[PDB]
Design a protein around this ligand. Structure first.
Ligand SMILES: CC(=O)N[C@H]1[C@@H](OP(=O)(O)OP(=O)(O)OC[C@H]2O[C@@H](n3ccc(=O)[nH]c3=O)[C@H](O)[C@@H]2O)O[C@H](CO)[C@@H](O)[C@@H]1O[C@H](C)C(=O)O
Ligand SMILES: CC(=O)N[C@H]1[C@@H](OP(=O)(O)OP(=O)(O)OC[C@H]2O[C@@H](n3ccc(=O)[nH]c3=O)[C@H](O)[C@@H]2O)O[C@H](CO)[C@@H](O)[C@@H]1O[C@H](C)C(=O)O
Ligand SMILES: CC(=O)N[C@H]1[C@@H](OP(=O)(O)OP(=O)(O)OC[C@H]2O[C@@H](n3ccc(=O)[nH]c3=O)[C@H](O)[C@@H]2O)O[C@H](CO)[C@@H](O)[C@@H]1O[C@H](C)C(=O)O
Ligand SMILES: CC(=O)N[C@H]1[C@@H](OP(=O)(O)OP(=O)(O)OC[C@H]2O[C@@H](n3ccc(=O)[nH]c3=O)[C@H](O)[C@@H]2O)O[C@H](CO)[C@@H](O)[C@@H]1O[C@H](C)C(=O)O
Lengths: 416, 416, 416, 416
């Protein structure tokens, strides 16, 4: 089966256009379900995770059309508020329909997500918020059902600033009676994108981007047109690639406000970075300086770039410590990095990376989306040739990484 | 030597006035050093930690007078920028003078804090920010020296949103040339208090309370008058005490915005809480419902109330999990709670509290400020009599806890 | 694709015969490579992991025949000491050929294992021991090569009492010049089985079962006949199944010495256990008492029974804590248990299990061998019907679990 | 108050005699309480912890005399089986009288130890074993009371191979009716010393040193004479001191079997070690090679030498990782090491030590016994002069460290 073959490459040089944010579009697609009417989403990346949630909307009865990076959804006529096991098993982001369906129809029944490679990922805070809004929750044979005679706005505290719980609760609250206050909300840029979209549909959501979100419920929302923000994680991936290959890359169609910790940490590692209104230029250093990273809720360092920074660190000039506070077991890639000659030792949530002279190409497997991309980065700098298996992980969330890296001068090919 | 004796008490009932925030006043006192002139701080709590940092200002040559909750500082004539080991050993908050002294005099030499009971507490991010502003850092025999020909504003990222590093860097940046941007800043209310004070002196500090702080340096700052915010941690202590004793207490002279997670979590445990403009009423439940807490940077649940919530949980109707993400070893109190009949098991940063019928009085020792106060709370509900040693820990940071609890009906006495 | 369907079952009752130990036979099969001659292994379980390592021996040129639980290996004519990526990727136990091949031929080149679901599982201590014996180690494109002009016995310390490193080093040392001393050796019963086999072939290995193993190298080893010990992990699985179903089961063809912590912990949970010379009877209690388990090196509680005890605890009468010290991320099953109505919260290496009234059947996936078996156990007690996917995990290491549970009265079927 | 002043010293050279083991003598002193008669302990180190437990025996009514390294105890006439709070608070090893007093008198009431600097140190497994032997346990106001009409031998499993629980249970079982089996026993050399002593008094204890201990209870024990084993931890301290100072030291009156991991790890770091029947010679290397250490139950690397190895690593030629599995918070010394210019970062139970050129003398505080000794080691190699406070920690458990290091050529003095 299919592999990505990467060879030791030249310093990457040139421009790369960044696609729309996968993790903005997924909750925003779920939000379309809140409107009796037709929404139009532009800048939608052509990605499997997009197609999966689109098929979920079809299941519940919304009409969906995708072309040329525009997705339209007509959620006028919904026929069921049940998300079955087979769909949720494909992608746990499917859970994001629960808030809108609960809000529109006052009842919804959604398969509870199971295990995921990157950790045990409960959805307790989503249910916490729904209960705060008046919903009664019950479990039936793997399904979670939430139902209410009516949703009523209430104050609620998030024990962790969960991205998904903030999204789900904001969407449910959008049609509740009265005012909902989400305390200790996620501040991730996708939260702000979603809020903006809800407001575009007629909602009243204030404070997205800050630690407190206030939603004043409205009776009905209408389909709206929305331009999704750029993918900050994709952008970060290309930035790290410039860093690691001693390249000089201009990443186009980005928002620098959303990249702050990545910019900072790359500068600390010795990159020269030039921030512009819609683009950023990254020049890799001649010697990578070791740095420590600690993943945290935004605007701390993002967990979705942790594997890729760890890969950069495998050849830094010293010792770097990587600490993952956000996900449990987001170190599955370490053993793959070590097969390429890295020197990485883990205990608990910390990985000690002792920089080596160079990596060496080897047969490796992607374990998840972001780690698979880190493996491509290793492949660019590893002596000889690197063959990466289980490539569906990567293709889930990167548009044409082979084409984009090839256009920057890298040696990469997908073989079937 | 001295002990606090607590007996099984009646439900606490009445009003308690909260003092000014210890942890606002300590950085604000250090900030007075930035002005060639006289500042006036009102609402200063009469606490040892206050007196220690005041003696540090005297050491460096500022004039200090304290009376009746007003502290004045005339920092017109400073005579040394060196903070010696003996003073810093007393209280690691002394380190907060480093930023102002560096800013005023472009050189400062401060003993590096050593071990602390509640964890290994490095000051690397403080030095990170000073280096970003142009300071060269060196170590001499336990001292850290920072010096520059001139401080220049720069962008810098905090790997963790450290309270102290945010404070120290904001103060240093206040007199730097140009604009400093602190990314991933602490959002704690004391950060906002400090900022306000600096602005009162003539500074230009914007975004305190948010994840990004921008300071535009000025050439000189002038003494100003400031009213310190209320102690949210003290307030929380009395709130928990109402919860645990099934009491009914009105806590006076507080800011509800600063108490959000404590209010939320207490309501989840079954308290009835009434929030007012300058006061909050807490009615304890008849049965405490078990809840989980997870300490986090503000506005997450505060580490300074963790021991006290754990004490409440020792008699909750079920199993609660307490997770400390902020400090390493902030569980020293667990063994003391267990001597009073609690059922608490720790591994890593998590403590499993399995609620018991009642605690039983016993001889215990305070291990630190906030835990010592938790022990007084246990003492209120523990059958018989509880004797608490090492009480200096408590007296550091609570004004007249014996008098305030006595006025609420509790049985407490300090014996020498 | 294929599923195991389990329904809510009657208390299991009857006798079950236990197969030979998978994890004794795998290193013992690798050990056959040490002899110029034919070995005969009896009591070999008919398992995929067995067939995989047998195909590895074929690759290197040994002759292998399997029938009726007897496997013979003629390692007279070995044709290569290289274990290629495709084989090692299938099963990391393939790494166990490295020690024998190094010992026989003074050179061997083995693909370095990559990621595994249950954690990052380095082989550094294996290489440590080989280096101690005189081997020079190098890495080539994912391969580890060990070579020496001659192996010389030496003392070496294991930083952790690794099962695999003890095995690999014992086998390498068996043909070394002089005496090897393994300090802080694994004490697992499989270590003793392997040692016995090596001694049967002509080796001189003393102290297996204790914290120190001494091997006095010999010039040549000869094929021998060996009876593998019973599978203590399989036995434990059936014991837990009796516990959870309130059953009454006699587990046949076992060694009670190898089951001590499992017996102890099951008695603590309320089982009545009767230990006999070659069998053990387990009667489940009417109410399971909550217990805590902590995985450790033998004779501590085995990690391979951790998931299955956790499953028992999901319906215990209270709160149990499960602590995994041996593997990092051996909690992947928790989310699957929670889909069946369990109440389990994890942080770090500890899982808090808050017992529920009953589990409820649901669609779940096996994540690994031992967890998949735990899911079958849940399926036996869960109201309604449980469907388990990814069943290859289970079939790897249990002989006919469907047939054996069916013979005890359970409702289980494998569907294709 | 009193300080230890250490200066940068010459390579240590010469011989040092090791005293008797503190941690053998403490349980063996408690064991004297089992005999109606007079015991004679030789090779007793002149240490505060010794004097504290001796005063506890006096409290309960045994007659004690200490001179010239011989301690005699006549436990013919015991007058109380209650150990009060004041004594147990001084030293938690006082808890070791519980097993003997329970065994002699079938009732005993012992204050439950509270917090300790190096971690939360429950005694649940001690109580577990006593309950297994027939004792009913209750808590009264900080006391734990154990009482039985008669102690009856039983099998019991230790969830962790606790040193103290193994000791306490072995002593209780020594006079029980029938046979006690301790499964997953501590294998520490002090367990073997204690067993030997009990057997000297007339007991029947087999398997000490192995993972299973069997005690066959006897009706009465008689006073006996015993020679305590050498202090392996003290010996290790002097060994590390040779390593760190590039010295050449012969440590006298030791048992090499008890020092295995320390010898191994020191050789890995580059020491040349010569093991003899009653002595060991350690020659420090010219360049310390970085190594990783992981504390574990014996014969794994001892937690009591962890701080001292960490100190050695502060100037090793690279990166070393120290992992503490045995105690929670046994890293309090890290901040003190960092005040001397070390580069150590902790997360969880792991500390990353990035070796520096040299340490620099500074004012530091001992946090506990073994760390205080590590600070003296740092003081020997740190440029200039190091002043160590809170020296009672050290004096607890080292005989005349100033005199012994002075006799090896070091510059050390205790000032009052
Ligand atoms: C669809 C989408 O946007 N997914 C992203 C979002 O996941 P999410 O699930 O919402 O993230 P969280 O809730 O903030 O989760 C953060 C932490 O909080 C725990 N938690 C979360 C919710 C809850 O109810 N209970 C609870 O305990 C949780 O287990 C985790 O430890 O945020 C993550 C963090 O940045 C991303 O890694 C993730 O990207 C992924 C890879 C991708 O592209 O596929
Ligand atoms: C004077 C004062 O306000 N002290 C308070 C302040 O300490 P601070 O020290 O500033 O808190 P941090 O820097 O946010 O520390 C939080 C975490 O960050 C790590 N860190 C911090 C700084 C740095 O450079 N490097 C670094 O790693 C640090 O080790 C900790 O794990 O904030 C704490 C958290 O709320 C409080 O517990 C603390 O109160 C106390 C008890 C009291 O009243 O005495
Ligand atoms: C073939 C076989 O017998 N496999 C078993 C054996 O694995 P092994 O691999 O030898 O076990 P370890 O080496 O004792 O591993 C224990 C711990 O030690 C770390 N470690 C190990 C080796 C090394 O060089 N470096 C190092 O760090 C390692 O990462 C782990 O955390 O022992 C394990 C523990 O009981 C079992 O779970 C495992 O069964 C399995 C599931 C099955 O049936 O497939
Ligand atoms: C008097 C004496 O010999 N003391 C020593 C002994 O303590 P001990 O207390 O017996 O050691 P453990 O019981 O093996 O403790 C090891 C671990 O096990 C947990 N545990 C222990 C008992 C119990 O019931 N429950 C339980 O959870 C415990 O919390 C720890 O994490 O063994 C330790 C380990 O080697 C030493 O560090 C300690 O030396 C000291 C410093 C000194 O010289 O003062």
């Amino acid at each position: 089966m299919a592999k990505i073959i990467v060879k030791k490459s030249n310093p990457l040089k040139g421009s790369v256009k960044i696609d729309g944010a996968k993790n903005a579009v997924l909750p925003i697609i779920a939000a379309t379900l809140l409107a009796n009417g037709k929404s139009t989403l532009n800048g939608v990346p052509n990605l499997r995770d997009v197609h999966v949630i689109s098929d979920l909307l079809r299941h519940v009865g919304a009409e969906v059309e995708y072309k040329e990076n525009t997705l339209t959804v007509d959620a006028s006529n919904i026929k069921t508020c049940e998300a079955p096991y087979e769909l949720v098993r494909k992608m746990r982001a499917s859970f994001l329909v629960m808030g809108p369906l609960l809000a529109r129809f006052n009842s919804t029944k959604i398969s509870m997500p199971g295990g995921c490679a990157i950790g045990t990922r409960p959805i307790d805070l989503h249910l916490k918020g729904f209960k705060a809004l008046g919903a009664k929750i019950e479990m039936d044979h793997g399904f979670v059902e939430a139902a209410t005679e009516k949703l009523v706005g209430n104050k609620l505290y998030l024990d962790f600033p969960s991205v998904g719980a903030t999204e789900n609760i904001m969407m449910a609250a959008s049609l509740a009676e009265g005012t909902t206050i989400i305390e200790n909300a996620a501040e991730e840029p996708e939260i702000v994108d979603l809020a903006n979209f809800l407001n575009e549909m007629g909602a009243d959501v204030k404070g997205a981007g800050t630690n407190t979100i206030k939603i004043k419920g409205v009776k009905e929302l209408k389909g709206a047109e929305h331009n999704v923000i750029p993918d900050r994680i994709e952008a970060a991936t290309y930035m790290v690639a410039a860093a690691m290959t001693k390249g000089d890359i201009t990443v186009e169609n980005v928002l620098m406000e959303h990249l702050k910790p990545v910019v900072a940490k790359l500068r600390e590692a010795g990159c020269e970075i030039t921030e512009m209104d819609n683009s950023v230029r990254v020049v890799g250093p001649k010697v990578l300086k070791p740095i420590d990273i600690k993943t945290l809720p935004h605007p701390g360092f993002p967990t979705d770039v942790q594997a890729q920074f760890m890969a950069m660190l495998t050849v830094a000039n010293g010792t770097g410590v990587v600490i993952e506070t956000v996900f449990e077991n987001r170190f599955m890639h370490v053993a793959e990095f070590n097969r390429m000659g890295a020197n990485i030792k883990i205990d608990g949530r910390s990985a000690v990376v002792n920089g080596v002279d160079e990596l060496h190409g080897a047969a490796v497997n992607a374990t998840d989306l972001r780690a698979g991309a880190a493996l491509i980065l290793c492949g660019l700098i590893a002596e000889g040739e690197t063959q990466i298996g289980e490539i569906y992980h990567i293709q889930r969330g990167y548009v044409d990484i082979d084409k984009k890296i090839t256009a920057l001068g890298g040696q990469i090919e997908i073989v079937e």
